[PDB]
C-alpha cells in the first residue's frame, strides 16, 4: 500500500517504496573506497559467472573527468544513465568556467537527477518514473579542500566520508574500516589496505580478474591500473601476512 505507492507515506514517516530501492544497491558487487591525504584508491570486486565471462572487459569503475572517477554498484543499466549524466555535468562545467569541478559539486548534480521520482510533483518537471537502483562512490581532488571521498545515495543526498564500502559485503567491510584506518597513511599503504579488507568480504578467490584498482592522484590523473599492477599487490600482500 505504502510500499506499492511511489509517493505514499507509511505511518512511521518513511517512503517505503523508496526504502526498498536501497536493497537494489546492495545486490551488486562490493566496492570499497578509501580516501587518503595523497589520493583516493577505489577498488572493486567483479563477478565472473563463467570463466567465459570477460570480467576484464567489464568495469564498474569509470572515468568522469581527468581527476574525477566513480565507483558504482547496483544496476549497470541505471549506472549507464547515472554515469552519463554526471559526465555531461563535468564537461558543461569545464565549458562554463574552464576550471576544475569540485568533488562535492559533481555530487550535487548526480543528486539532482535522483530527486526526480514523480509524475505530478513540483520543483523540476518530472520525466523519470522510478528511483535509481544505483549508488556512487564519488572520488576527486580539488586543491582548496584536498583529496576527498563522497558517497551518493539515490534515496538520500551527498555524504562526506573518509571511507565507505557499498555492495553485498558493505556491512562487514565497514567494521574493518572502523578498526583499521589512519590519518597516518600514504597511498602505498592505502592500496594494500583496500585489498586486505576486500578479500575477507570476497567469496570469489582474490585474483586480478575479479579485482581492479584505480586511483585519483591529481598528479597522475584518473588512472585505471593494469592487471599486471593488480597481480603485484596481491603478492606483496601475501608476503606481508606470512611475516605477520
Amino acid at each position: 500500500e505504502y510500499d506499492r505507492g511511489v509517493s505514499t507515506f507509511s505511518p512511521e514517516g518513511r517512503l517505503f517504496q523508496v526504502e526498498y530501492s536501497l536493497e537494489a544497491i546492495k545486490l551488486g558487487s562490493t566496492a570499497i573506497g578509501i580516501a587518503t591525504k595523497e589520493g583516493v584508491v577505489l577498488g572493486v570486486e567483479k563477478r565472473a559467472t563463467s570463466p567465459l565471462l570477460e570480467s576484464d572487459s567489464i568495469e564498474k569503475i569509470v572515468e568522469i573527468d581527468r581527476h574525477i572517477g566513480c565507483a558504482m554498484s547496483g544496476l549497470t543499466a541505471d549506472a549507464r544513465s547515472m554515469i552519463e549524466h554526471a559526465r555531461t555535468a563535468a564537461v558543461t562545467h569545464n565549458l562554463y568556467y574552464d576550471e576544475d569541478i569540485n568533488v562535492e559539486s559533481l555530487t550535487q548534480s548526480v543528486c539532482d537527477l535522483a530527486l526526480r521520482f514523480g509524475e505530478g510533483a513540483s520543483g523540476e518537471e518530472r520525466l523519470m518514473s522510478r528511483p535509481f537502483g544505483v549508488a556512487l562512490l564519488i572520488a576527486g581532488h580539488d586543491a582548496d579542500d584536498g583529496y576527498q571521498l563522497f558517497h551518493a545515495e539515490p534515496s538520500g543526498t551527498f555524504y562526506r566520508y573518509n571511507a565507505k564500502a557499498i555492495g553485498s559485503g558493505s556491512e562487514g567491510a565497514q567494521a574493518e574500516l572502523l578498526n583499521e584506518w589512519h590519518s597516518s597513511l600514504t597511498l602505498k599503504e592505502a592500496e594494500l589496505l583496500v585489498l586486505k579488507i576486500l578479500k575477507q568480504v570476497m567469496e570469489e578467490k582474490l585474483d586480478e580478474n575479479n579485482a581492479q584498482l584505480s586511483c585519483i592522484t591529481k598528479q597522475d590523473g584518473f588512472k585505471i591500473y593494469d592487471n599486471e599492477k593488480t597481480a603485484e599487490l596481491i603478492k606483496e600482500l601475501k608476503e606481508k601476512e606470512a611475516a605477520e
Binding site: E63, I64, D65, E84, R87, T88, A90, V91, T92, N94, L95, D98
Partner: protein, 212 residues
C-alpha cells in the same frame, strides 16, 4: 587575418598572426588565433572572432566527452565533422567561420579539414584562409615540399606571416608557431614580426624593395 596550416613528413605546422581590425584601427595585437581544443587537436580562429571562439571551446568539450564515453582517443575526422554539422544548423544568422582542424592520429596520420559556416568540408594538405590568404599562398606553395626538414618547415611557417604583414593591411601583430606531432601539439613560441623582419631580410637578401 592570415591563417594557414600545411602538412609534411614530420607532422603538421600551424602558423597564425595576431593583428585584428574593427574599423581601420587595430583592436588588438596580442590576439591568439590558435585555440587549444584539447592536447591532440588544434584549430584556428579566422573569419569572425566571436563565432570561432565560442564553437571551438564547445568542440573540445565534445571531444573530452567522447573520450570519457568510449575510453579512447578523438579522431581528426570525428572532431571535424561534429563542427560542420553544428555550423549548418546555425547558418543563415550572420555565422562566419574559417577554421582548419589539425590533428595527428595514429590511425589516419596527420589530416587537415577546412570548415566554413556554410558547412563546407574539404580534405586537403594545404590550406591558407583569411584576407591576406593570397599573399601567404604565394609564399606557401613555392617553398612547399613533402620531403622537408622540421627546422626548415618552422622557417616556412614564419615566412608566410612575414610577407603577408607588409602587403595585407590587417595582418601583423606577431607570429605564433605550433607543431602537431603524434603525441600532441608542441609550441615553438611567439615571435614579434618586426624583429623577425630584419633577420630574414638579411638571410635570403629578400625584401630589398621594402625600405623606409
Amino acid at each position: 587575418t592570415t591563417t594557414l596550416a600545411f602538412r609534411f613528413q614530420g607532422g603538421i605546422i600551424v602558423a597564425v598572426d595576431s593583428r585584428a581590425t574593427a574599423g581601420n584601427w587595430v583592436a588588438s595585437q596580442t590576439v591568439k588565433k590558435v585555440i587549444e581544443i584539447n592536447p591532440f587537436l588544434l584549430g584556428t580562429m579566422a573569419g569572425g572572432a566571436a563565432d570561432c571562439q565560442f564553437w571551438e571551446t564547445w568542440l573540445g568539450s565534445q571531444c573530452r566527452l567522447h573520450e570519457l564515453r568510449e575510453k579512447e582517443r578523438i579522431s581528426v575526422a570525428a572532431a571535424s565533422k561534429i563542427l560542420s554539422n553544428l555550423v549548418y544548423q546555425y547558418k543563415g544568422a550572420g555565422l562566419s567561420m574559417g577554421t582548419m582542424i589539425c590533428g595527428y592520429t595514429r590511425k589516419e596520420g596527420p589530416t587537415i579539414y577546412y570548415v566554413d559556416s556554410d558547412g563546407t568540408r574539404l580534405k586537403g594538405d594545404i590550406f591558407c584562409v583569411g584576407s591576406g590568404q593570397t599573399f601567404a599562398y604565394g609564399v606557401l606553395d613555392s617553398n612547399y615540399k613533402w620531403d622537408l626538414s622540421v627546422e626548415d618547415a618552422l622557417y616556412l611557417g614564419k615566412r608566410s606571416i612575414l610577407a603577408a604583414a607588409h602587403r595585407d593591411a590587417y595582418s601583423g601583430g606577431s607570429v605564433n608557431l605550433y607543431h602537431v606531432t603524434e603525441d600532441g601539439w608542441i609550441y615553438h613560441g611567439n615571435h614579434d614580426v618586426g624583429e623577425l623582419f630584419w633577420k630574414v631580410k638579411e638571410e635570403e637578401g629578400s625584401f630589398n624593395n621594402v625600405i623606409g
